[PDB]
């Protein structure tokens, strides 16, 4: 609605750290669903 000021999104970045704590497989299930694996491959940037 309003310009700038995320707040909510910022809250995610916090829990995001859990990713390192949790196995990549935990998200791998949904990850492959979006195609984040073949997203880069040979992109770089």
């Amino acid at each position: 609605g309003s310009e700038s000021q995320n707040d909510e999104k910022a809250l995610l970045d916090q829990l995001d750290s859990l990713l390192s704590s949790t196995d990549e497989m935990e998200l791998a299930e949904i990850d492959r669903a979006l195609g984040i694996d073949k997203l880069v491959s040979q992109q770089g940037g």
Binding site: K9, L12, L15, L19, S20, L27, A33, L34
Partner: protein
Amino acid sequence: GSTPPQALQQLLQTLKSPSSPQQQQQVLQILKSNPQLMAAFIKQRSQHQQ
């Protein structure tokens, strides 16, 4: 009002929280339609890889 990118943030909220099983499957459906958005998620693992 008109931000297709932030759409990932909304759903991502359920993907990060211990939401129900149905929700988790929902978010994935959205991110799937947004290939440019999912890229944001990788940012985490990319900045938190070993």
